[PDB]
Symmetry: C6
Subunit: 91 residues, 6 copies
């Protein structure tokens, strides 16, 4: 297992991916400074398109509590419907 191979599934809840991310990151042989830098880069890059789009609107300076509260709706009826509703207006 490698922290770089950790990617968020398309139907995986955000709370679990960050769980495996932090579950595996606590094992990667590196310094705490590197592990914090990993968090700043990987976590937002290896997320799925739906979650990444939500995070790009948050701007910088957000915390997990700010991310996860914004992503635990992804995969929910309001999200899936809103996404499916915006597409019909796009087409």
């Amino acid at each position: 297992t490698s922290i770089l191979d950790i990617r968020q599934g398309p139907k995986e809840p955000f709370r679990d991916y960050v769980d495996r991310f932090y579950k595996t990151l606590r094992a990667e042989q590196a310094s705490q400074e590197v592990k914090n830098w990993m968090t700043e880069t990987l976590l937002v890059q290896n997320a799925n398109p739906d979650c990444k789009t939500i995070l790009k609107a948050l701007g910088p300076g957000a915390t997990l509590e700010e991310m996860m509260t914004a992503c635990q709706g992804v995969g929910g009826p309001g999200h899936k419907a809103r996404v499916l509703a915006e597409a019909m207006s796009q087409v």
Copy 2:
């Protein structure tokens, strides 16, 4: 294992989450006064948008059994359609 890490999944029924909440809350080393304050605060805060939207409409003073009965529709055919139908009107 921390009570603050307990978050409702987007496809998780409200019942399970409250069970994990109280199953996890039963382990947190704290005073009973603080644990009651947790329930009033986190339980509805760490929920997903669909339930929090329903719970925000109940207002305050609502009882557990009073809420759990209002969220067991989320994820059902009647709900998903009502969500999907109101969304088409939103756009």
Copy 3:
């Protein structure tokens, strides 16, 4: 475990909830006469809206066998579509 904590999930089939209900009702330490009263009251109240909507339409004089035959369509293609179509007409 308590008879009052047994509630049907939003995506759970009826045939199972009644199984959990009667599996727990046979465990509650109480008299047989009161347990029948539980059946008449809890079973239809602690169900989800979709099944409750169909059971309320049967009226009084049901026999459980008449209910379960009326709810095994909930969650199926015919139902989910029928529900989604009636909502499309509203908005």
Copy 4:
């Protein structure tokens, strides 16, 4: 369990339901003549609306191997879509 409690779930394949039906019928204490009559009556009566709609259209005289082939389409994209389309025109 009792053969009369065997009911097809809304999301259960017909092949599985008929599997449990015969799995239980081989245990119910009854005569071969009694068990044959059960097959003719319950199997099509305890089925879900989607399958019963297909089997009611076949009429009588239909054979097992002739029914299974008519119900293993239920739950497929063509079915759910065809059903999901006819309802939109019905409402």
Copy 5:
């Protein structure tokens, strides 16, 4: 078990059914000519409507790898949509 009872589920991938088909065929007491004739006959008949629809367009002569590649799309986002779109146009 029996090779004649092997039927493709409505929500089952093809590669699994062909897996179970050959899993059972390797046990059926028969001649190699019988098993080959089984393969040419049952495999396409006991498939579900969606897959049988695609195979009927391939005609005869097609090879396994030639078929399997045409059926691993059934149940995917592109398939379910194409099926749902042709049905909306049919009515």
Copy 6:
């Protein structure tokens, strides 16, 4: 057999590549053959939706370039975009 590994219609790409490489590490072959297997089967035995995305990426792309393009398949945005293009296509 490495040839029998195919991506299901509802299987994530990251899982199929796992099973793909899980078998390839056992197949008795030369390193050159296993690399050629990777270059050929991996993109061919995937499902239409993922293959549709990979056919658009062209050649010269690495796994990290693919996996990052297929983890949207099966997500709400994907099924919706696909379902929206189909309504206009038909």
